[PDB]
Amino acid sequence: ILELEAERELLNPPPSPLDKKFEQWEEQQAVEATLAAMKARRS
Amino acid sequence: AALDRGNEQLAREALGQRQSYQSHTEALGKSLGEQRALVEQVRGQLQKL
Amino acid sequence: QEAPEDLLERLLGEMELELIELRRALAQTIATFKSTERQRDAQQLIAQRWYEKAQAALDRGNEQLAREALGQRQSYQSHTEALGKSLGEQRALVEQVRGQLQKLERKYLELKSQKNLYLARLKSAIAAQKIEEIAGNLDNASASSLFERIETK
Amino acid sequence: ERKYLELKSQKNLYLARLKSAIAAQKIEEIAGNLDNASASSLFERIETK
Amino acid sequence: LLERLLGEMELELIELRRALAQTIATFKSTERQRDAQQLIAQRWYEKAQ
Amino acid sequence: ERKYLELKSQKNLYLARLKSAIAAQKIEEIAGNLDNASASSLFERIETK
Amino acid sequence: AALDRGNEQLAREALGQRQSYQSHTEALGKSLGEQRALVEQVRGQLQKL
């Protein structure tokens, strides 16, 4: 099992942690912007 | 609706929920905007043949 | 020798079977995980009952029977602990495999949504040269078939 | 008699994990993700043809 | 000789890939063994305490 | 893995150029252009016969 | 986008990331600009033959 998993992963590299950091940061920015626009539109 | 009554927490969780569906919508729109021109071209080829 | 486009539908059918196979296997896994949890609950219940008997035996100052019952309780306590350990281990693994199944089930239909377009484009491309062979357009006189051999004959 | 059912309680989990792992590379072969262009099958041979 | 040598290299590449996979596997296995050993040591330390 | 496909991306061009070069002298042999009368084949042996 | 909000660090890392892809783009453009003339010449030869 470990061999097959490692081989499949070796054929196609998973995303680097930097990519994860970037996507997490930008989705945080997105949710903040959306909630801010919502709570501002109500007033 | 959840933001109303000042219950910001549920609003935050729902806005977080919305993101996956937004992303899937974007991906599908991409794929369709791609495929359209190809079916147009193949239809033209069929006419000519 | 087989044609490459023919392998497409074959491999997709194979994968289609293999997906439901995986689903059935995961179902059976969930089943016994539930069964083991039930067994653990029954064991700890029996241990609690023996504890109640020991408590009752201590009443009336009959300490000896209380001692024997408390000694009896230990094996069931140990078995409860072991089963709790095993379950706390297995849970995360079934979570991970369920996630994997979700992702695969999505990717499969993702590919099935383009198999057809590829087949159509390939068939059009074949038909192109198919009738370009017969009765060449004679943009160049390099080669024409079935309308020149007949004409020359 | 105890140890036997002990092992039977994990045979199934092992089989499930192995089948999932196999299926992973099974459809990773067809239509590679093209994270790298090192090799892709059944969607490039068709495209190149 | 061109196509012959290219086919040979094509085989040899996937061979190398498989070997590296097996290497990664046992490296993980050895790490797991180390963790188990240090866990047992910690348990004996608890008993001593 | 990168360098391999790098070379595979030019094997074909080399083969094509070589085949063209061979075909050049192949039909230059038969029915020489007679820019010089040094040697012509299969259209002079027939003519002389 | 990362430079916006004054987060210069992520901008620096992303700009560093961009360089490898820029270099690969340049190399491939080089190779194509090379190959074009050769296929033109061989096509002309084929016509004449």
Do A2 and E22 make contact, defined as CB atoms within 8 angstroms? no
CA distances from G45 to F33, F34, G39 (A): 16, 20, 10
What tokens appear for A7 in the block? Answer: 């081989």
Which phi and psi angles does F30 have, rounded to 5°? -65, 135
Residue partners of C118: CB distance under 8 A and separation at least 6: C5, C8, D43, D46, D47
Instruction: Work out the minimum CA distance from E4 to partner chain A, whole angstroms.
Output: 24
D40 vs A: CB within 8 A? no
Residue among D9, D23, D43 minimizing CB distance to C18: D23
The experimental technique behind this entry is cryo-EM
Please name the helix (run of DSSP H) or strand (run of DSSP E) that holds residue G39, with its range, or none: helix G8-48
Which phi and psi angles does C3 have, rounded to 5°? -85, 140
Length in residues, chain E: 49
What resolution does the deposited structure have, in angstroms? Answer: 3.6
- Report CA torsion sign: B23, B25, B26, B31: positive
Q: How far apart are CA G19 and CA G25, in angstroms?
A: 10
Q: How far apart are CA A19 and CA C46, in angstroms?
A: 53
CB A1 within 8 A of CB D21: yes
Our CA dihedral for E25, E27, E30, E35, rounded to 10 degrees, sits at: -100
What tokens appear for A3 in the block? Answer: 């061999």
Instruction: Work out the minimum CA distance from D35 to partner chain F, whole angstroms.
Output: 13
The Cα diameter of chain C in Å comes to 125
Residue partners of D34: CB distance under 8 A and separation at least 6: D40
Do A35 and B8 make contact, defined as CB atoms within 8 angstroms? yes
E31 vs F: CB within 8 A? no
Q: How far apart are CA C38 and CA A35, in angstroms?
A: 44
D36 vs A: CB within 8 A? yes
Q: Can you tell me which residue has the tokens 């002309």?
A: G44
Closest residue of chain E to F9, computed from CA coordinates: E6
Q: For residue C122, which of C13, C6, C1 has the smallest C-alpha distance?
A: C6
Which phi and psi angles does E34 have, rounded to 5°? -60, -45
DSSP code for D37: S
Q: Can you tell me which residue has the tokens 């995303």?
A: A15
Q: Which residues from F are below 8 Å from D44, CB to CB?
A: none
CB D39 within 8 A of CB E17: no
Number of Cβ within 10 Å of residue B15's Cβ equals 18
CA C11 to centroid of chain Cα atoms: 17
Amino acid at site B24: H
Instruction: Work out the minimum CA distance from G48 to partner chain A, whole angstroms.
Output: 46
CB E23 within 8 A of CB A9: no
Q: Which residues from G are below 8 Å from A24, CB to CB?
A: none
Residue partners of D46: CB distance under 8 A and separation at least 6: C4, C5, C8, C118, C122
Most A CBs within 10 A among D13, D25, D38, D40, hence the mutation to make, goes to D25
CB D16 within 8 A of CB C29: yes
Closest residue of chain A to E20, computed from CA coordinates: A7
Q: Three-state SS for E1?
A: coil
Residue partners of C115: CB distance under 8 A and separation at least 6: C8, C9, C12
